[PDB]
T-cell receptor, first 199, second 246 residues
């Protein structure tokens, strides 16, 4: 009663087709269904199928192959709202007990129409001391790596959406209490586009 | 309409103490399952009942864990005494006979449990709001504020932005997870970041008020605390900033 599933996390661009899948060894498993789990939420049913065949619902197609003992979930035209962990759940007919796979994290990256790569300095409010560098408006085809040492903290990309203006963007943050630390060489260890600024 | 309800949502406690998680399944449903979820073992079934009678307890540990449904609309899961390795998210699920055939279980929002070796490792969060850069406003007719929550443990926190006393989601982005302030140490304090972007004009309005808010889940009333330090209780720490033009 054990099922295999690569945890990922796989990162794909909005519109990309994605493939998730589990494999198992017990032939007793006769029912299969995919659940979806959003960060800090409970799992929610998404798809389910019996024996061999392929169930298609909108952008999702679920399959199962009892011979290969292999189950898959295809998401076409991946949308940001699809970012979550997908868990395959299976069981036999002698019990309603479900067996789950560890689950795969999928991060589908928002497609930002007009990039404007730039890094800024934000001042501490009231009175605090620790430079805070913002890297923003860069395209989703850009990765943000961790800083060499630990005194310089960095958070991965994050997309915000200003629904009032049909506009969205990314941003990563880097802060440190270290003296030599300054924006401009704040993201050195990351492959960033040509754009950068300085006050 | 009303889904599965679990309580409490968060639960931070010291080892050796009893912990009681409760769940209320959906009306009508005569099947109730209990699961646990961790990064290492994944989502695991512990026990499930049918009409208040437990059917499968294979996933239950030894007698330290205990479960039951005294009646059809209430179940309980008890750990006595608790231990660090029991830390996890415990989910309650509920279903019917006909739904289980099509394999549909309805899961509750879950209970995050953290059993610690001792409470002296618990610290609430520090919170700072950093103001936008003049360049970002000149280069673009938009202003991005930034919030930073640091030095908190364990990682039970919920950060939110409030604009003029109202919570705003449009133009917000928070770090999916927190990052350890010192990865080296087996345990370590955490930090989380968030950002809020409004239109340059909105930020330049001297009336608009922006406040970053972080809910932390720590100790409670009965939790002992014999140390000269602001008891690290469940609370809300916040930083703020006002709209300005110049």
């Amino acid at each position: 009663k054990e099922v295999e599933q690569d945890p990922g996390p796989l990162s794909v661009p909005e519109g990309a087709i994605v493939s998730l899948n589990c494999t198992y060894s017990n032939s007793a498993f006769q029912y299969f269904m995919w659940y979806r789990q959003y960060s800090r939420k409970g799992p929610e049913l998404l798809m389910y199928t019996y024996s061999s065949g392929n169930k298609e619902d909108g952008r999702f197609t679920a399959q199962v192959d009892k011979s290969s003992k292999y189950i898959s979930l295809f998401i076409r035209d991946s949308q940001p709202s699809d970012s979550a962990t997908y868990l395959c759940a299976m069981r036999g007919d002698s019990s309603y007990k479900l067996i789950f796979g560890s689950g795969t994290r999928l991060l589908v990256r928002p497609d930002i129409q007009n990039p404007d790569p730039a890094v800024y300095q934000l001042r501490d409010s009231k009175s605090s001391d620790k430079s805070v560098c913002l890297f923003t408006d860069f395209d989703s085809q850009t990765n943000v790596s961790q800083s060499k040492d630990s005194d310089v903290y960095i958070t991965d990309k994050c997309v915000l959406d200003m629904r009032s203006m049909d506009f969205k963007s990314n941003s990563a943050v880097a802060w440190s209490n270290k003296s030599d630390f300054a924006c401009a060489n704040a993201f050195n260890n990351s492959i960033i586009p040509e754009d950068t600024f300085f006050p | 309409d009303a889904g599965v309800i679990q309580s409490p949502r968060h639960e931070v406690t010291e080892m050796g103490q009893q912990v009681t998680l409760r769940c209320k399944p959906i009306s009508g449903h005569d099947y109730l399952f209990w699961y646990r979820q961790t990064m290492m073992r994944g989502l695991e079934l512990l026990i499930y009942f049918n009409n208040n009678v437990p059917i499968d307890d294979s996933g239950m540990p030894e007698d330290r864990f205990s479960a039951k449904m005294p009646n059809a609309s209430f179940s309980t899961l008890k750990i006595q005494p608790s231990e660090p390795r029991d830390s996890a998210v415990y989910f309650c699920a509920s279903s019917l006979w006909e739904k289980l055939a099509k394999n549909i279980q309805y899961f509750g929002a879950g209970t995050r449990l953290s059993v610690l070796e001792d409470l002296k490792n618990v610290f609430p969060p520090e919170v700072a709001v950093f103001e936008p850069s003049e360049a970002e406003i000149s280069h673009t007719q938009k202003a991005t504020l930034v919030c930073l929550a640091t030095g908190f443990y364990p990682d039970h926190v919920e950060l939110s932005w409030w604009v003029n006393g109202k919570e705003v989601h449009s133009g917000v982005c928070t770090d999916p997870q927190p990052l350890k302030e010192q990865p080296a140490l087996n345990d370590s304090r955490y930090a989380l970041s968030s950002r809020l972007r409004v239109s340059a004009t909105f930020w330049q309005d001297p009336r608009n008020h922006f406040r970053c808010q972080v809910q932390f889940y720590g100790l409670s009333e009965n939790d002992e605390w014999t140390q000269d330090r602001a008891k690290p209780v469940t609370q809300i720490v916040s930083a703020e900033a006002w709209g300005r033009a110049d």
